[PDB]
Structures are given as structure tokens and as C-alpha cells.
Amino acid sequence: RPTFYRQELNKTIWEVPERYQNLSPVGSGAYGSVCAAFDTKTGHRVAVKKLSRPFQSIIHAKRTYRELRLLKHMKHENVIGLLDVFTPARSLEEFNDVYLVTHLMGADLNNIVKCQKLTDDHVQFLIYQILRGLKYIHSADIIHRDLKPSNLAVNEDCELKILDFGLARVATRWYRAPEIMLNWMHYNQTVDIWSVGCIMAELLTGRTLFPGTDHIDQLKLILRLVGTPGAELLKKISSESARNYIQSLAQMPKMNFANVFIGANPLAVDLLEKMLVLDSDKRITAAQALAHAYFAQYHDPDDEPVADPYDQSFESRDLLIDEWKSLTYDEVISFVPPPLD
């Protein structure tokens, strides 16, 4: 096993192999903090994320096993991927800290939206990569459900990777499909397509499409643009209070996207209209959206791969903290790094 060295960063203790040098904090999330480092084996800067209290409870323990098993499965250019996984522990009884290594990106999509003037070619390329990674993710039977700007890491090259959890260093509600906020409790993959549609609209206009103050106000803003739900959608709503409140609204017609997004590429307006429909069954899928004329300059059917089937059976099991702890330890030991290009 490699040699480790210890240091304190942000009132935290980091124990990492010697190969990673010059640790520098980037940001923090709710389940871990991220540092930039120099990988002496490759000469590249990487990103090292120390999980916060990985095995403090059953919930934390399962979440840790979930992220590790998921990340180990993600092998795609537009999806965050694992370059290395390490723990300072040399035994399972010592096992209590988990680190994850990945490529170091340039910034979040909030920082690229901060400039507020993206060229239409920037939107084609950025949204094409999101959709490309989303097709891979959705091919694994995986739904993201929390897509938002902080989840899109980009380099100055404009190359994009989808992150499972971004840096909290944006309410999230602004990018959630309406069914989620209705608590439908069983979502199509197209819930992510709705999020993508909300992101693309921001990149084009420079403003939040649905900057709602809460969940009801959010649904009210959505209704203004897309219009009141049709009779065939109201049938599918079981909650009477939900139906009653949606029906009891004053009712508004669907706005013409050509007007609200005037000045934008007409091919982008058509794509948005196919993404932001209330019926999840009618929303364009990631695969179909890649074939949209808006992406003619980047689309390649032979270079948009799918993922192997991902087994999420463990999600229904209720196990003890030590069982989740040992399975995670098993996944750390079984890790095989990808070959350096």
C-alpha cells in the first residue's frame, strides 16, 4: 500500500497518498468537501473529495455505498468518473474515511452563467454534452432527479461533465419538473429532460426561466408559460386537493415560445418546446433530442454510447451500519483505476 501524509484543511483532517500533492480547497457540499491536488503519477491536477461522516448512521452508510457503487459504474466522457478511491485504513475495523479522486474541472455552470452572454454555439455544445451524458445515464436505468447548474462542471475548453453532487460553496426548486413538486412519487427519466430545458433557457436568455419563491409559486410560473394542464393530464392526477387547486386556478393559455424566447435560434426554440411539456410521457428523450436539428454540428450516432445495466437492487434492502460499512470496504478494495491515456 502507498504511503500517506496528514494535514488539516478547513478545520478538517486529510490523509492522502503521497502521489497527490499541493492540496487546495475548492468548495464543499452537504456530503463532502473537495480539494484540488497535483497527481505526481500523471502530471495532471485532479479533484479529491473526502466524504463527510461516511458511516455515522445507516443513512450515511447506505449513501456512501450508493455513491461509490454508482461512480465506479460511470464510464463516459460527459459523466464524472473515478480515477482513484482510497482509505487510510488497512483493515475493516479501521475503515472509517473514504476519498474519491476524479478529474479537476474549471468551474460550475453558475460561473459560466455569471458572464450571462453565451454564444448560440456555446449553447449547442454545452447542452449537447448534457444530453449525451444523460443518454448514457438513462441507459443505465438511472434518473438524476436533481439536475441544476452546480451539477455541470465545465473547463475553459467548454467540455462538460455531469456531477452526481455539485459544490454548494440556486434553490434547486427552479429546475424541478412539476410532477416532482406534486409528489407524484414515481418519475419518468424525462424529469431530467425538464431540468435540462430549464438550464438551456437560462443559458440563452441570461435569466432564470422559473425563479419561483416556493413549490406552489413554482407551479404557477410553469403554468403561465406552458398553460393550464389539459383534461387528459388532469385525469391522471389522483390527489383531489391537487386537482382542485390546479382546476380552481384562473386558467391561462400556453404562451408561444417564439415570443418569450425571441432572438434565440429558432432551432433552439423548437427544442425547448419539445422539452418543457407538462406530460412526462410526451417530453423528448435524451436520445431523441441528440438527433434534433439544433445539434447537427455535433451529433454523431456512432459516438453516443450507452451504459451497461446498473444493478440498484441494494436500494430496497434494510441493512445494519456495519453491513453497509463492509460492502463499501469491499468496493474500495475491488476498485481498478482506468488506464492512463
Ligand SMILES: COc1ccccc1Nc1cc2cnn(-c3csc(C(=O)NC4COC4)c3)c2cc1F
Ligand atoms: C472530487 O470530488 C468528487 C469526487 C467524486 C464524485 C464527485 C465529486 N464532486 C466534485 C467533482 C468535481 C470536479 N471538478 N469540480 C469542480 C466544480 S467547480 C471547480 C473549480 O472551480 N475548479 C478550478 C479551481 O481549480 C480549477 C471544480 C468538482 C466539484 C465537485 F463537487
Ligand SMILES: CCCCCCCCO[C@@H]1O[C@H](CO)[C@@H](O)[C@H](O)[C@H]1O
Ligand atoms: C453521474 C450520475 C448521477 C446520478 C444521480 C444520483 C445522485 C443525485 O441524486 C440523488 O440521488 C437520488 C437518486 O434518484 C435523487 O433522487 C436525489 O434527488 C438525490 O439525493
Ligand SMILES: CCCCCCCCO[C@@H]1O[C@H](CO)[C@@H](O)[C@H](O)[C@H]1O
Ligand atoms: C401543476 C401543473 C400540472 C403538472 C402536470 C405534470 C404531469 C406529469 O406527467 C405525468 O408524469 C407522471 C409521472 O411523474 C406519469 O405517471 C404520467 O403519465 C405523466 O402524464
